[PDB]
Amino acid sequence: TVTNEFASRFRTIVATLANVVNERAVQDDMQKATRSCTKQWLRHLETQFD
Amino acid sequence: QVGIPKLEVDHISFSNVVSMMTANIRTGDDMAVERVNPDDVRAINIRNA
Amino acid sequence: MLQQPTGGYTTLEQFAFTIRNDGTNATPTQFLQLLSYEATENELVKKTIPTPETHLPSARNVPGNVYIEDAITQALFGISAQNVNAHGYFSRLSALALPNTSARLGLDGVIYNSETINIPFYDPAAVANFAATYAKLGNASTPRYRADMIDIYAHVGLELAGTDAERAAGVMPVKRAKFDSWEGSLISLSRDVVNWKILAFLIDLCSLEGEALRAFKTRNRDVFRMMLFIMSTAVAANVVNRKVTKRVDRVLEYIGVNSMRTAGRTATITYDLSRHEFAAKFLQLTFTRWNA
Amino acid sequence: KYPSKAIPADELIDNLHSWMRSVHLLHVRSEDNTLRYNWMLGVYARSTNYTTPVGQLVVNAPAILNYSNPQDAFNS
Amino acid sequence: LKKIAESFEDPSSIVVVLEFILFALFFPTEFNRIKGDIQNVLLLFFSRWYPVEYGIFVQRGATYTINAAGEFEFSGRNEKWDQALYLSEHFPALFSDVP
Numbered sequence: 355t356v357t358n359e360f361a362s363r364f365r366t367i368v369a370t371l372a373n374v375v376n377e378r379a380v381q382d383d384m385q386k387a388t389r390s391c392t393k394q395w396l397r398h399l400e401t402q403f404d
Numbered sequence: 405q406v407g408i409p410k411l412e413v414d415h416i417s418f419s420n421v422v423s424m425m426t427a428n429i430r431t432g433d434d435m436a437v438e439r440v441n442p443d444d445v446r447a448i449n450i451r452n453a
Numbered sequence: 454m455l456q457q458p459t460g461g462y463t464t465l466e467q468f469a470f471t472i473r474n475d476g477t478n479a480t481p482t483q484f485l486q487l488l489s490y491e492a493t494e495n496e497l498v499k500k501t502i503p504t505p506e507t508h509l510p511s512a513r514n515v516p517g518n519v520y521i522e523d524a525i526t527q528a529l530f531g532i533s534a535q536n537v538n539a540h541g542y543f544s545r546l547s548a549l550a551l552p553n554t555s556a557r558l559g560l561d562g563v564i565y566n567s568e569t570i571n572i573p574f575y576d577p578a579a580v581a582n583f584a585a586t587y588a589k590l591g592n593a594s595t596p597r598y599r600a601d602m603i604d605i606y607a608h609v610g611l612e613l614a615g616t617d618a619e620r621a622a623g624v625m626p627v628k629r630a631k632f633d634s635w636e637g638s639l640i641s642l643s644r645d646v647v648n649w650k651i652l653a654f655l656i657d658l659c660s661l662e663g664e665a666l667r668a669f670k671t672r673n674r675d676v677f678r679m680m681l682f683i684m685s686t687a688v689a690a691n692v693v694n695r696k697v698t699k700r701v702d703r704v705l706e707y708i709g710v711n712s713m714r715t716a717g718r719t720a721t722i723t724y725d726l727s728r729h730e731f732a733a734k735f736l737q738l739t740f741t742r743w744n745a
Numbered sequence: 746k747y748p749s750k751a752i753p754a755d756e757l758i759d760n761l762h763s764w765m766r767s768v769h770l771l772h773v774r775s776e777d778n779t780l781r782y783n784w785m786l787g788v789y790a791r792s793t794n795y796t797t798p799v800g801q802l803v804v805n806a807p808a809i810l811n812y813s814n815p816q817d818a819f820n821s
Numbered sequence: 822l823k824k825i826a827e828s829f830e831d832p833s834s835i836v837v838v839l840e841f842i843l844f845a846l847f848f849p850t851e852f853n854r855i856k857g858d859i860q861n862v863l864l865l866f867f868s869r870w871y872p873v874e875y876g877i878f879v880q881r882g883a884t885y886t887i888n889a890a891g892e893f894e895f896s897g898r899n900e901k902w903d904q905a906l907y908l909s910e911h912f913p914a915l916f917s918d919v920p
């Protein structure tokens with residue numbers, strides 16, 4: 355009635371991608387910034403997808 | 405027997421097989437490409453190659 | 454389909470190997486009589502040739518009938534060939550390597566993908582044997598499989614210049630070849646060789662076995678030596694003429710030493726680096742087959 | 746600082762010691778007994794301050810400096 | 822594939838990966854046609870983000886061929902995919918799903 359298997363698959367996809375973006379070591383400060391911004395934006399794409 | 409090469413001997417030969425490219429070939433025409441600049445100048449590496 | 458005789462395909466008059474010389478179609482043996490050798494202080498010693506890799510390169514899906522004989526003979530003796538590895542059509546030989554393939558290798562020296570009318574072609578078993586070794590010309594360039602291109606020429610020397618005692622010993626003095634010569638001799642020799650249907654020689658070299666094979670090696674030794682000669686001039690460090698009292702003696706130095714030269718010269722055909730890798734691989738395979 | 750006489754041992758030990766404190770090679774320690782540490786690449790990456798591609802590779806994946814087979818230390 | 826230039830330095834470069842993942846989902850078939858060509862971009866990604874793993878993986882080989890009885894045979898050698906390979910026996914190895 356409620357859950358959509360496709361959307362949930364995308365949810366685990368962006369959770370994986372967020373873990374990967376998270377574990378991505380960087381040196382420049384702006385890189386360190388866009389890491390977290392990337393994380394937010396993935397988190398938004400998930401809602402668009404659902 | 406192989407044929408005697410024409411340049412090897414002094415007789416003139418007025419028929420010969422010239423290779424020629426067809427309409428399908430075309431050499432020397434200008435050609436187009438997409439060029440893609442590096443995203444950040446500071447990311448470009450020189451050494452160690 | 455052309456039947457293969459009890460002797461090789463080379464026994465057929467259709468596949469005669471003959472350089473031009475003195476205004477006639479001289480056989481290679483009677484050109485090699487003209488060759489004479491000045492031994493120098495250096496010594497060639499033949500190392501064991503590494504066994505050719507088991508791997509047969511993939512024949513990429515190619516619709517066309519690849520002219521392979523032309524590709525090979527140009528890669529080894531072509532005056533103007535270069536970048537003989539950028540195209541990678543030698544891998545196509547592997548298409549013939551399969552048992553019961555629909556492909557056939559024509560006497561024209563083209564690899565047709567299917568049997569086709571009015572085009573004579575070698576017996577597929579023999580060609581399967583030939584492809585099973587010479588497809589590896591396809592990995593002449595691949596970094597994992599490149600042949601030694603320095604050591605191998607020692608064998609070339611031994612098989613070209615080496616006296617029967619030197620060939621038995623496995624070591625000969627580095628030699629400097631010479632012969633009375635016509636203008637542009639090495640070029641015309643190299644092209645008389647380029648026109649040779651060497652696929653016959655190779656298919657007989659790979660398919661024949663037993664006494665019939667060994668009788669081949671003796672019958673065709675001078676031919677193989679001529680290929681070795683063209684190739685050795687291709688890598689010879691220098692190639693002068695000598696005045697000899699109203700006669701001219703061409704002198705290539707030195708046999709068996711690959712100078713690794715790549716810059717061109719009027720005197721001889723020249724190997725680009727790709728051609729060096731290719732010739733090295735070809736020598737590796739052909740010599741591996743010539744000793745067994 | 747000492748054109749004429751030998752550098753006094755106290756100054757040599759003190760300064761060399763402080764510089765020794767100053768150095769710290771990148772690494773990821775691990776339990777495997779077969780492992781070594783590609784010291785050449787480690788010190789080199791350090792000396793460039795990790796600006797060469799080898800330096801980036803080391804600064805991002807220090808574990809790459811560890812090696813069992815000595816040759817694969819570089820092939821990696 | 823319309824080729825992508827990405828060099829995968831900034832974390833945001835992950836976007837290209839996502840653009841592929843989404844393409845795998847919405848169009849699994851067409852993705853299957855262009856997948857080697859996308860594997861070329863992915864390899865630039867993996868060589869940056871996971872160099873040690875990329876080392877072991879590429880060391881197994883960049884491609885493979887299924888044989889009789891269906892077993893995979895990986896190339897043992899890194900090399901760029903070309904669509905010239907789509908009609909050949911070879912598959913991009915990134916999609917083998919072999920642990």
Ligand SMILES: Nc1nc2c(ncn2[C@@H]2O[C@H](COP(=O)(O)OP(=O)(O)OP(=O)(O)O)[C@@H](O)[C@H]2O)c(=O)[nH]1
Nearest residue numbers: 770782783784785786787788789790791792793818
């Ligand atoms: N920067 C750097 N260079 C090294 C290192 N290890 C060896 N080398 C250099 O590698 C070169 C050749 O390596 P080795 O064969 O081990 O040294 P060598 O040729 O026997 O000569 P020596 O180094 O004087 O003992 C030498 O000239 C060294 O300077 C290292 O850890 N870091």
